[PDB]
Structures are given as structure tokens and as C-alpha cells.
From a paper:
The key enzyme in the salvage pathway is hypoxanthine–guanine–(xanthine) phosphoribosyltransferase (HG(X)PRT)4. Inhibition of hypoxanthine–guanine–xanthine phosphoribosyltransferase activity decreases the pool of 6-oxo and 6-amino purine nucleoside monophosphates required for DNA and RNA synthesis, resulting in a reduction in cell growth. Five compounds synthesized here that contain a purine base covalently linked by a prolinol group to one or two phosphonate groups have Ki values ranging from 3 nM to >10 μM, depending on the structure of the inhibitor and the biological origin of the enzyme. X-ray crystal structures show that, on binding, these prolinol-containing inhibitors stimulated the movement of active site loops in the enzyme.
The TBrHGPRT1·4 complex refines as a dimer, while the TBrHGPRT1·5 complex refines as two dimers. There is only one difference in the chemical structure of these two ligands, and this is the isomeric attachment of the prolinol ring to the N9 atom of the purine ring. The (R) isomer does once again have the highest affinity (cf. Ki value of 3 nM with 70 nM). As found for 5, the carbonyl oxygen of 4 does not make any interactions in the active site. The difference in their binding, therefore, lies in the positioning of the phosphonate group attached to the nitrogen atom in the prolinol ring. The large electron density found around the phosphonate group attached to the carbon atom in the prolinol ring when 4 binds has been assigned to a magnesium ion. The distances between the metal ion and water and the phosphonyl oxygen agree with the ligation chemistry. Thus, when this compound binds, a magnesium ion is found in an unpredicted locality and assists in binding this ligand.
Residue numbers in the entry:
A (entry chain A): 3 to 79, 102 to 195
B (entry chain B): 5 to 81, 101 to 203
């Protein structure tokens, strides 16, 4: 047993560890955008949330950004010309999605574009791509939780965990 | 009040979560004979309205603590739900025009059962009769932001549900006019 979850071989990042890492990222974002005079209504940071599972990351991250004085408005994948855009994704793997999203948003002429991902899987790149902000790295191993799914289940798990091979083989 | 844009805090984050844990226990009890399990038979969460991502993110994790596994779908600005149990989530229920349509549409697919859970219910806003099975907070006719709820797309990130200062929206409203 040892692992808290009967469906996981091991826990990689707890909810608390993820929030701690996300607070470190939020401090950097607060400093990086301090010369942008972000304000609710007049000038929020535009959060563009990409991929269905990212709703969890996105919910926690905007709240933490608020704790740090970075006000936001959210879009899920418009009116962004001259606004700062921060694309959120719960997992960066091949980078094919984020490359397409970033390139498409540039056509709307935002004042700036950066990306922030909860889980970077550098081993999966099919094109070169570096996110400006990375909460945590994961090696080659199939993880679920914190919004990340296996066949639509286990997104609600509060930690990022390694899915036990027996689960997806059988399924 | 620590928010300069708010008249006062109405529901703290902790109060919302406490109330959501009470609701979660009822849901775990209500569905306990449905044999919910991941993959095989999760509860299907249908999340409606853009601001509902915050409520939905917290609620599925809390339902997980209570042994209710889920999968999620979004309807903002459907799938294999026939024979499945469906719980529709919405951060605010007001006129009920949206939820009435979503539920009736979903019923055309003949789920095993369908219920609604809402974070904020404003009973005084109804334009048609509607009662959610599960209600985190019943709110009177005051204008609130936070916990997913916006004013012109801002303030969703506020961790509490707070009463917006009238000056904020009459000043912003006026400004939005100088632009049109
Ligand atoms: N759950 C999980 N998926 C993994 C893992 N390693 C790779 N994948 C792939 C599966 C596929 C679909 O994933 C949507 C998950 P959601 O965002 O809805 O939570 N991915 C992308 O599409 C990334 C966007 P990319 O950079 O590749 O374009 C990631 C892992 O360990 N765990
Ligand atoms: N922010 C805020 N909105 C309030 C309040 N009282 C009423 N409303 C309305 C405004 C309008 C659009 O709000 C989407 C917010 P989001 O879901 O994206 O978070 N509503 C609906 O459309 C409900 C769906 P209905 O039941 O009417 O069909 C709720 C309040 O106090 N505060
Ligand atoms: Mg997905
Ligand atoms: Mg909305």
C-alpha cells in the first residue's frame, strides 16, 4: 500500500507543494509585470486557459495571483489588443498546442504574451518550446491529478500522482 | 473591509468550503447506492457558465474527499450521458433561464438521473420556477463578485464572495459609455 491512493504507485507533488511552487511563480509574475500597472477593469492580466483539465490549475492560480496583487480576467480555449496575455496550461508535453495558441494570439496584437504551465514534461517535445513559467517538472511517467486525467477520470485528485500501470492496461 | 472595491465580505472562502463539505456529505449519501467509481461509472459533472470554473475546481476535489469520483464537462461561451448520473454545477442561479434549458436538454439524452448544485442561489431573481437540489448559499438581491463571479470580467479571482461598491460599477458603467 504505502501510497495513499490505491490507484497510484506514488505521489509526485502534493497540493501544498504545488501551491508553494505557485506562490514562488506568482511573486515572479508580480515583479515581472509591476511596470505594467495592472488594474481590475482598466487593465487586468488576460489569463488564457488552454485544455479542458486546466480549470483546476487556473482556478488556484488566479486566486494566488490575486493574493500577490496581480488582477486578472479569464478566457477558456477576442478583445486583447494592447493587453498583457498569460497563457495557462496544466501540462506542456509536445508543445504543439501551446505553439499554435501563442501564434494565433499574436495575430490579435496583445501588448505581450507569456506562458505558464503547471507540469512541464520536457521529454515530450516534438518542437522546441520553453514556457516562461513552470510550476513543476515531471519525468517520463504517466501522471494524473490536479486537473490531469486518465480517460476523463482522476482530474479531481488533489495531488499529482503516478498512475499505476495496472489501471490503464486493464482499461 | 480589506477589499477597496467592496462594501464588505459576505462569504469567506472558508465559509464557502465549509458549506461545500456539508453539501458533499449529502451527495455522497444520496448517491451511495449508485456504485460510483472512476472510469467505470463516475458522476458526470456538467459545469455551466464561465465563472463556474472556481466552484467546479473546488467542488470536484471536495467530492473526491468524500468518495464521490467525477468526470467533468463544460458549457460556457453532449457526450455519453445516457444511463449516467449527471450533476449540473453553476456558480450562480438567478433567473433560472439557463439551468432550465440545460437540464431539459440533458434530459433528452435520458441520463439515469440529473440534479443541480449551485454555489449562489438568488431566489428573488427567478423568471421561471426552479429549485436546485443542492445550494451552497442563498443570497438576497445584492450584487456580489468573487469566487468565480465577475463584474465586467474582473474580480473572479477574489477568494471571498463580496458585495461590490456601487461606486465601482456606476463609475465603470459611465466609463464604458465614454468609449461607445
Ligand atoms: N493526464 C496526463 N496526460 C499526458 C501525460 N503525458 C502526456 N500527456 C498527454 C495527453 C494529452 C492530452 O492531455 C490533456 C490533459 P488536460 O490538459 O485536459 O488535463 N496531452 C496534451 O495534449 C498536452 C498539450 P501539448 O504540449 O502536448 O500540445 C498531454 C501525463 O503524464 N498525464
Ligand atoms: N457577478 C454577479 N452576477 C449576478 C448577480 N445577480 C445576478 N447576476 C446575474 C448576472 C448574470 C451573468 O452572470 C454570469 C456570472 P458567471 O456565471 O460567469 O460567474 N447571471 C446569470 O446569467 C445567471 C444564470 P440565470 O439563472 O439568470 O439563467 C447572474 C450578482 O450578485 N453578481
Ligand atoms: Mg484535456
Ligand atoms: Mg459567465
Amino acid at each position: 500500500p504505502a501510497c495513499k491512493y490505491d490507484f497510484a504507485t506514488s505521489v509526485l507533488f502534493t497540493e501544498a507543494e504545488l501551491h508553494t511552487r505557485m506562490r514562488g511563480v506568482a511573486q515572479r509574475i508580480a515583479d515581472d509585470y509591476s511596470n505594467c500597472n495592472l488594474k481590475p477593469l482598466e487593465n487586468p492580466l488576460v489569463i488564457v486557459s488552454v485544455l479542458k483539465g486546466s480549470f483546476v490549475f487556473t482556478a488556484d492560480m488566479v486566486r494566488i495571483l490575486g493574493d500577490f496583487g496581480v488582477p486578472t480576467r479569464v478566457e477558456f480555449l477576442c478583445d486583447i489588443r494592447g493587453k498583457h496575455v498569460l497563457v495557462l496550461e496544466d501540462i506542456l508535453d509536445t508543445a504543439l498546442t501551446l505553439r499554435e495558441v501563442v501564434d494565433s494570439l499574436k495575430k490579435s496584437e496583445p501588448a505581450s504574451i507569456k506562458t505558464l504551465v503547471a507540469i512541464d514534461k520536457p521529454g515530450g517535445r516534438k518542437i522546441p518550446f520553453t514556457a516562461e513559467y513552470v510550476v513543476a517538472d515531471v519525468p517520463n511517467v504517466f501522471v494524473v491529478g490536479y486537473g490531469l486525467d486518465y480517460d476523463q477520470s482522476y482530474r479531481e485528485v488533489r495531488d499529482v500522482v503516478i498512475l499505476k500501470p495496472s489501471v490503464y492496461e486493464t482499461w
